[PDB]
Design a protein around this ligand. Structure first.
Ligand code: CA
Ligand code: CA
Ligand code: MN
Ligand code: MN
Lengths: 293, 355, 582
C-alpha cells in the first residue's frame, strides 16, 4: 500500500540519478505529495544537527552528483539546501525533481528552502520555463513546480542556533516570530519581508542600504550582530551570492555565504562548498571543483 | 501459413469505392459544356465532380493533355481519371500519378510547375502575380523548394508517395480554397515568406546572374556567418554533383535551402544541412578537431569585437552538457536532433548575431 | 510455429511506437523462416524496402538482419534480391547505418557466384560510385575489395577505373573515404597493378591538400608494405612515409608515430635499423606535444622489436639520450605517457644498464610534481619488479605514495587508493603493515565521502590478498574503534566497513567480532546511524546462523521498529521481512 509507492519512488530516484527525467504525470503526482508535506513545515523550519548545508545549484545536475560524492548519499547524510535549484543550467528539471523526490522519500533527512529563483517571474526569464517546455511538450510541469515552490519554507533554524536563509536579513523583520507570522504560500513579492529574505545581501557598508540587484536590502555587520544577539543565534548561514572560494565568512563570522554551483554557468571560475555541522553543531567546510565530463 | 499469415504486401494498395458513380458525375458535368469539352475556366466544376479539392484542377487538366489545345474532351478526361481510380487507392498516390513522368512513380521539381502555375493564376491572394514575370517565376521556384525541404526528407531528388503521405502537403493544397489570404498558409505557399527570401537573395546577387558566390554569401546578414562555414556551403556537403565545387557558385534554388536553414536550425532538415557542413571528414561524428577548426574563428571574431571568448575547453564542456550525446566524446547527428538545442550548438560555432 | 503472433509481428513493422518496430525488425529472422523462402522474397523484402524510419536503432537493426538473410531467401541463387534494400540503406543520412549497410553487402558478396557479381553486385557499386551525393560515393569505396578477386579481367579493369575516380573526386569527404579503403583494395589486386596503379593513387592522396586525406596514407603505407617484397620498399613506399614524417600537419605526423609499430613490423628490421630509428628520434623531439606524447608511448614496443644484433647498441647510443630529454619535457601528457611504459625497458637492457641508466630516470619521475606522472610509474613496476628487486625500490616508492595518499586533490587520493591492493601485493604484508596500514586507516576518515567509500572497499580488496586472520589482527580493531567518533559520518563508515568485510571474513569472525558492535550502535543518538544499523543487519544476516538471528538480532530490529524516527522504523521493518524474522 505505502510500500508499493515507496519502491515506485525509489525507482524514480534511481532513474533521476541517471539524469533521466520523470514524466509529466509522475511529476504531477510527486508535486501533490510534496505540497502535502511542505504545507506542514513552518516558515522557520526546526532542523536538528547533524546536517550538511548547501547553497545555489542552479540546474548544474552533474555538479550536484559531485556534491553527493563529497558529502555522502542521501539518506545516509542529512542535507539542508538553501534554494536556487533551478534556472541557468541545462538540467534544472532533473535537478529539482531529484531534490523534491528526496524530500518526499525522506521527510526528515533533507530540508529544501526557497531561493529567489523558485519564482514564476524569474524562471520565465532565466531558463527553467523554456527547459520544461523543451522537455515536456507543454507548460504544466513548470506550472506544477511553481505551485510547489510557493509551499517551500523560507528559513531554517538548526538547533535553535544557526539560521539558514537563501538571501539575507530584512528591515521589516526583527525576530523569528515575525517570520513565522508571515504568509509564505504565495509567489515572491517584488518588495516586503518575504522578498527580502530571499533577495538581501551582506555588505562592507554599515546599516541597511538598497540592493544593487533591484530587490531587497544590503546589510552590514552592525545589523547582523543586532539580529543574532536579539534571536540567540551563533551565525547566519546563507547562499545567493557567488563567492569565488565556495564559502565566505563575513561580519566577523556572524554570516557565512555558501555557494554550491562550481564554475557558475561555465564561466565564473569559482569553487563550490558545503558546510557540515556535526553532532554538536560544530562547523567544517568542504570545497569542490566541478565534475569532469 | 498461407492462411494464418494472409498476404500483407500490395504492389498498388488495398481498397470499396464506386468508380462508375464518379465517371457518371464527371459525364453529367461535362454535358454542361460546348461540345462536351472542358476549358481551364470549367475545371473547378470538374475537380469537384472528381471528388477532389479545387486546386487539383490544374494537375487534372494537365494530366489529360488539356493545355495542348486549351480544352480537353470528356472521353479523354474520363479515360485517365478512370485509370487513376483503378490504380491509386489514396490521395498521395493519385496526386503523384497525375503529375509524374511516365514510368517514374516519383515527383521531380519540374513536375510541380503546372500545379503551381495554376495556383498563381487562380488564387485570390496572388492576383497581382498573374503577369508572366520575374517575381512570378521566382515565387514558383521558391515554393517548390519549400515543398522539397519539408517533404523529401531523403534528399533524393524524388518525392515519393510514402513521403507525400507522411507530410502535410496535401492538407495545404486542400486549405487553398478555404483561405483567401495566402500568408495564412505559412508552411509552403506564403507569399510574405517568399518575399523575404527573394529580397535577401536579390540584394546579394548584384550582377543579377541568378547565381551567387562565396564572397556574395559572406555579405549576408553583415557577415554574421563565419567564413569557414561559408566556404563549406560550396564544398559538396549540401549540393548535388560536381558543378558547385568547380565554380564556387550556387543557384537561387540552393540559396533557398541555405536561407531556410539559417532562419530556423531546430528543424530536422536544417540539422542535417548544418551537420553535413560541420562533419569536415564525413565520418558521421564531430571530432574535437572539427569543432576547434570552427571555434578558433569564432574566437578571433569575438576578439575583434572586444568580447571575452569562452576558452575552447570550457566551451566543449558546455556543448557536451547541452547536447547529451549517447556515446561519450562523439557528437552525432542523432544526438543533435534529440537535444532540442541544436540551434544554440550551431550558433555557438559559426554565428555571431548576439550581438 | 504459431503463426498468429508472427503475423502480428509483421503488422507491428508499421506501428507508431519505435520499440514495437524495433522488436519486429530484430525478429525478421523468425518472420522470414515461418513464411518460408518463396514469400520472404515476393512480399517481405518489397514491404520492407518501402518503409521509412527516421530512427537509427531501427535502420541499423534492419541492415544487420539483411546481412544474415541468404538462407532465408533460398540461398546463393537468390541473394541478389537483398541488394535493393541495402542500396537505399547505403544512402541514408546517417553514417552509422550507411557503414552497417556496407558491412552487410560485404558479407553478402561471398554468396554471389562470379556471374552474379558481374551481373548485379557490380552494377550496384557503379551506381553508388556515380551517385549524386558524396554520402553515396563514400559507401561505394568499401565494396571494391570484396568483389574484385572473383570477377573477369575486363571487369577488374572497370573497378580499377571507378576506384581511381573516387580517389580523384572533387569532394574531399570521398577522397578520405577512398584513402581509408586503399590498403584493403590493394591487398586483392595483382602485384603488377599494385605497382602501376595503386602506388600512383597512394602518392597523390599522400600529398592531397586536406590533411584528413593525407593522414590516412600512413595506414595505407602499412598495408602496401605488407603486400610488397622488401627489396621494392625503399623505392615505392619510403619516400612517401618519409614525406609523412616531416609533413606540415601535426595530425599526419601523429599518425605515423601512432602507427610506428605496425610500420616497423611491416617494413622489415633492415629498414627499421636504417630509416625508422632516425625518423623516430625526430618524432620524439617534435615541436607539437601531442606528437611527442604519441611517440613516448611507443618506446617499449619499438625497442623490443629491433633485430638483436643492433638492438642493444642503438637503444643505448641513440634512443636513451632522447628519453633523458623527454623526462624533463615541459608537457605533462608527454611525461606521463612515457611514465606508463618507460620501466618496461629494463628486461630489454639487463639489470646492468637498468641500474646505471634507467634507475635514475624512474627516480626522477617519482619526484615529478605532476601526479599523473607518478601514478603512471607507481602502477607499472610489475615489469622491472621481477627483473630487479621491488625490495630495492621500496625506500623510494614510500615517500611518493605518502605524498599522493595525502594530496589536496581528492581525485589524486582516489587514484592511489585504487592502486593500493596491487602495491600491497608487490611489497608484501610485512612492509604493508609496517608502513602502509596507517595510510589506509587515515582514508577511512578522509573529509570526502568518495574517499571514505573507496577506502572501505579497498579493505575488502586487502582481505582477499592477505586472508581473514590478518584482517582480525591488523584491521578490525581500528575499524571498530571508529564507532566512538563523535562525528556521525565517521560512525556510519564503521558500519559500511563491516558491510563489506563480512563478505570475506566468514561467519565466526563476523558473529563474534563485528556483530556485537553493530547491535550496540542501535542506541546511537543520531537516527542516521540507527537506521544503518538495521540496513547493516540485513546485509550481514545471511552470513549468520539462525540461532544468532533469532536470539540476538531479532530483538534489536524489533526494538528499532518502535523507534521514534520514521526511517529507522522503516528499515528495521525491511530487515525483519527480508531476513524472514517477521
Ligand atoms: Ca551573381
Ligand atoms: Ca568528423
Ligand atoms: Mn542564485
Ligand atoms: Mn539567489
Amino acid at each position: 500500500d505505502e510500500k508499493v509507492f515507496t519502491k515506485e519512488l525509489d525507482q524514480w530516484i534511481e532513474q533521476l540519478n541517471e539524469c533521466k527525467q520523470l514524466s509529466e504525470s509522475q511529476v504531477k503526482s510527486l508535486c501533490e505529495k510534496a505540497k502535502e508535506i511542505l504545507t506542514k513545515e513552518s516558515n522557520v523550519q526546526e532542523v536538528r544537527c547533524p546536517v550538511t548545508v548547501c547553497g545555489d545549484v542552479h540546474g548544474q545536475f552533474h555538479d550536484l552528483m559531485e556534491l553527493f560524492r563529497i558529502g555522502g548519499k542521501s539518506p545516509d547524510t542529512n542535507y539542508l539546501f538553501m534554494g536556487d535549484y533551478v534556472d541557468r543550467g541545462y538540467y534544472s528539471v532533473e535537478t529539482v525533481t531529484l531534490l523534491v523526490a528526496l524530500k518526499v522519500r525522506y521527510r526528515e533527512r533533507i530540508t529544501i528552502l526557497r531561493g529567489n529563483h523558485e519564482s514564476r517571474q524569474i524562471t520565465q526569464v532565466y531558463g527553467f520555463y523554456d527547459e520544461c517546455l523543451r522537455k515536456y511538450g507543454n507548460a504544466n510541469v513548470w506550472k506544477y513546480f511553481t505551485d510547489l515552490f510557493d509551499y517551500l519554507p523560507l528559513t531554517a533554524l538548526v538547533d535553535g542556533q544557526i539560521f539558514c536563509l537563501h538571501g539575507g536579513l530584512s528591515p521589516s523583520i526583527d525576530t523569528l516570530d515575525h517570520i513565522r507570522a508571515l504568509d509564505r504560500l504565495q509567489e515572491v513579492p517584488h518588495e516586503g519581508p518575504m522578498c527580502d529574505l530571499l533577495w538581501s545581501d551582506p555588505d562592507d557598508r554599515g546599516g541597511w542600504g538598497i540592493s544593487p540587484r533591484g530587490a531587497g536590502y544590503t546589510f552590514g555587520q552592525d545589523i547582523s550582530e543586532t539580529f543574532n544577539h536579539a534571536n540567540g543565534l551563533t551565525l547566519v548561514s546563507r547562499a545567493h551570492q557567488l563567492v569565488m572560494e565556495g564559502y565566505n565568512w563575513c561580519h566577523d563570522r556572524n554570516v557565512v555565504t555558501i555557494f554550491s554551483a562550481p564554475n557558475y554557468c561555465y564561466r565564473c571560475g569559482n569553487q563550490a562548498a558545503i558546510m557540515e555541522l556535526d553532532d554538536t553543531l560544530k562547523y567544517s567546510f568542504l570545497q569542490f571543483d566541478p565534475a569532469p565530463r | 501459413s498461407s492462411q494464418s499469415i494472409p498476404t500483407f504486401y500490395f504492389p498498388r494498395g488495398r481498397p470499396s469505392v464506386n468508380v462508375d458513380a464518379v465517371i457518371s458525375k464527371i459525364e453529367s458535368t461535362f454535358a454542361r459544356f460546348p461540345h462536351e469539352r472542358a476549358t481551364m475556366d470549367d475545371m473547378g466544376l470538374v475537380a469537384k465532380a472528381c471528388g477532389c479539392p479545387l486546386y487539383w484542377k490544374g494537375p487534372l487538366f494537365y494530366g489529360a493533355g488539356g493545355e495542348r489545345t486549351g480544352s480537353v474532351s470528356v472521353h479523354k478526361f474520363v479515360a485517365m481519371w478512370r485509370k487513376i481510380l483503378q490504380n491509386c487507392h489514396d490521395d498521395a498516390a493519385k496526386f503523384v500519378h497525375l503529375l509524374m513522368s511516365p514510368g517514374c512513380n516519383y515527383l521531380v521539381q519540374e513536375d510541380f510547375v503546372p500545379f503551381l502555375q495554376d495556383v498563381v493564376n487562380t488564387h485570390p491572394g496572388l492576383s497581382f502575380l498573374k503577369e508572366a514575370s520575374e517575381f512570378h517565376s521566382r515565387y514558383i521556384t521558391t515554393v517548390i523548394q519549400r515543398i522539397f525541404y519539408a517533404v523529401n526528407r531523403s534528399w533524393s531528388g524524388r518525392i515519393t508517395c510514402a513521403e507525400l503521405r507522411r507530410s502535410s502537403f496535401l492538407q495545404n493544397v486542400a486549405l487553398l480554397e478555404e483561405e483567401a489570404d495566402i500568408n495564412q498558409l505559412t508552411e509552403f505557399f506564403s507569399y510574405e515568406h517568399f518575399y523575404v527570401i527573394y529580397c535577401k537573395f536579390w540584394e546579394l546577387d548584384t550582377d543579377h546572374d541568378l547565381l551567387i558566390d562565396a564572397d556574395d554569401l559572406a555579405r549576408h546578414n553583415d557577415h554574421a556567418l563565419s567564413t569557414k562555414m561559408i566556404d563549406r556551403i560550396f564544398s559538396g556537403a549540401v549540393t548535388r554533383g560536381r558543378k558547385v565545387q568547380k565554380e564556387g557558385k550556387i543557384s537561387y534554388a540552393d540559396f533557398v535551402w541555405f536561407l531556410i536553414s539559417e532562419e530556423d536550425k531546430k528543424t530536422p532538415t536544417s540539422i542535417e544541412y548544418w551537420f553535413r557542413c560541420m562533419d569536415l571528414d564525413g565520418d558521421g561524428a564531430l571530432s574535437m578537431f572539427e569543432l576547434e577548426y570552427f571555434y578558433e574563428e569564432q574566437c578571433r571574431r569575438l576578439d575583434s569585437m572586444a568580447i571575452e571568448a569562452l576558452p575552447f575547453q570550457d566551451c566543449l564542456c558546455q556543448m557536451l552538457d547541452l547536447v547529451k550525446p549517447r556515446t561519450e566524446g562523439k557528437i552525432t547527428l542523432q544526438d543533435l536532433k534529440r537535444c532540442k538545442l541544436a540551434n544554440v550548438f550551431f550558433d555557438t560555432f559559426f554565428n555571431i548575431e548576439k550581438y | 510455429m504459431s503463426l498468429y503472433p508472427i503475423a502480428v509481428l509483421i503488422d507491428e513493422l508499421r506501428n507508431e511506437d519505435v520499440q514495437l518496430r524495433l522488436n519486429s525488425i530484430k525478429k525478421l529472422s523468425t518472420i522470414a523462416l515461418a513464411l518460408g523462402v518463396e514469400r520472404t522474397r515476393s512480399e517481405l523484402l518489397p514491404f520492407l524496402t518501402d518503409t521509412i524510419y527516421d530512427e537509427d536503432e531501427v535502420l541499423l537493426a534492419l541492415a544487420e538482419q539483411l546481412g544474415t538473410f541468404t538462407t532465408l531467401v533460398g540461398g546463393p541463387e537468390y541473394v541478389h534480391c537483398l541488394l535493393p534494400p541495402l542500396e537505399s540503406l547505403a544512402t541514408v543520412e546517417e553514417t552509422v547505418v550507411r557503414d552497417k549497410a556496407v558491412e552487410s553487402l560485404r558479407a553478402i558478396s561471398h554468396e554471389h557466384s562470379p556471374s552474379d557479381l558481374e551481373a548485379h553486385f557490380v552494377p550496384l557499386v557503379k551506381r553508388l560510385a556515380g551517385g549524386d551525393w558524396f554520402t553515396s560515393r563514400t559507401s561505394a569505396c568499401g565494396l571494391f575489395s570484396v568483389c574484385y578477386p572473383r570477377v573477369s579481367s575486363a571487369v577488374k579493369a572497370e573497378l580499377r577505373q571507378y576506384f581511381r575516380n573516387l580517389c580523384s573526386d572533387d569532394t574531399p569527404m570521398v577522397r578520405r573515404a577512398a584513402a581509408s579503403k586503399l590498403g584493403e583494395f590493394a591487398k586483392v589486386l595483382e602485384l603488377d597493378n599494385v605497382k602501376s596503379e595503386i602506388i600512383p593513387m597512394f602518392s597523390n592522396l599522400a600529398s592531397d591538400e586536406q590533411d584528413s586525406v593525407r593522414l590516412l596514407a600512413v595506414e595505407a603505407c602499412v598495408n602496401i608494405a605488407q603486400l610488397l617484397p622488401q627489396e621494392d620498399l625503399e623505392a615505392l613506399v619510403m619516400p612517401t612515409l618519409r614525406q609523412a614524417a616531416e609533413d606540415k600537419s601535426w595530425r599526419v605526423r601523429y599518425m605515423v608515430a601512432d602507427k610506428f609499430t605496425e610500420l616497423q613490423k611491416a617494413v622489415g628490421p633492415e629498414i627499421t635499423k636504417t630509416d625508422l630509428v632516425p625518423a623516430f628520434q625526430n618524432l620524439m623531439k617534435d615541436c607539437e606535444a601531442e606528437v611527442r606524447a604519441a611517440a613516448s608511448h611507443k618506446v617499449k614496443e619499438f625497442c623490443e622489436n629491433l633485430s638483436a644484433d643492433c638492438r642493444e647498441n642503438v637503444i643505448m647510443s641513440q634512443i636513451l639520450p632522447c628519453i633523458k630529454e623527454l623526462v624533463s619535457d615541459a608537457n605533462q601528457h608527454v611525461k606521463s605517457a612515457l611514465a606508463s611504459v618507460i620501466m618496461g625497458l629494463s628486461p630489454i637492457l639487463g639489470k646492468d644498464n637498468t641500474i646505471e641508466h634507467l634507475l635514475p630516470l624512474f627516480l626522477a619521475q617519482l619526484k615529478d610534481e605532476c601526479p599523473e606522472v607518478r601514478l603512471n610509474i607507481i602502477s607499472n613496476l610489475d615489469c622491472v619488479n621481477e627483473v630487479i628487486g621491488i625490495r630495492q625500490l621500496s625506500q623510494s616508492l614510500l615517500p611518493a605514495i605518502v605524498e599522493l595518499a595525502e594530496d589536496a586533490k581528492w581525485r589524486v587520493r582516489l587514484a592511489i587508493i585504487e592502486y593500493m591492493p596491487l602495491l600491497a601485493g608487490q611489497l608484501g604484508v610485512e612492509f604493508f603493515d609496517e608502513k602502509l596500514n596507517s595510510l589506509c586507516m587515515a582514508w577511512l576518515v578522509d573529509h570526502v565521502y568518495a574517499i571514505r567509500e573507496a577506502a572501505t572497499s579497498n579493505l575488502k580488496k586487502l582481505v582477499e590478498k592477505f586472508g581473514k586472520e590478518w584482517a582480525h589482527a591488523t584491521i578490525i580493531p581500528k575499524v571498530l574503534a571508529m564507532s566512538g567518533d563523535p562525528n556521525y559520518l565517521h560512525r556510519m563508515t564503521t558500519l559500511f566497513c563491516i558491510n563489506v568485510l563480512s563478505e570475506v571474513c566468514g561467519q565466526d569472525i563476523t558473529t563474534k567480532h563485528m556483530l556485537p558492535t553493530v547491535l550496540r550502535m542501535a542506541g546511537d543518538p543520531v537516527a542516521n546511524v540507527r537506521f544503518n544499523v538495521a540496513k547493516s543487519l540485513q546485509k550481514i544476516g545471511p552470513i549468520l546462523d539462525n540461532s544468532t538471528l533469532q536470539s540476538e538480532v531479532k530483538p534489536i530490529l524489533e526494538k528499532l521498529t518502535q523507534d521514534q524516527d520514521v526511517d529507522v522504523k522503516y528499515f528495521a521493518q525491511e530487515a525483519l521481512t527480508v531476513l524472514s524474522l517477521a
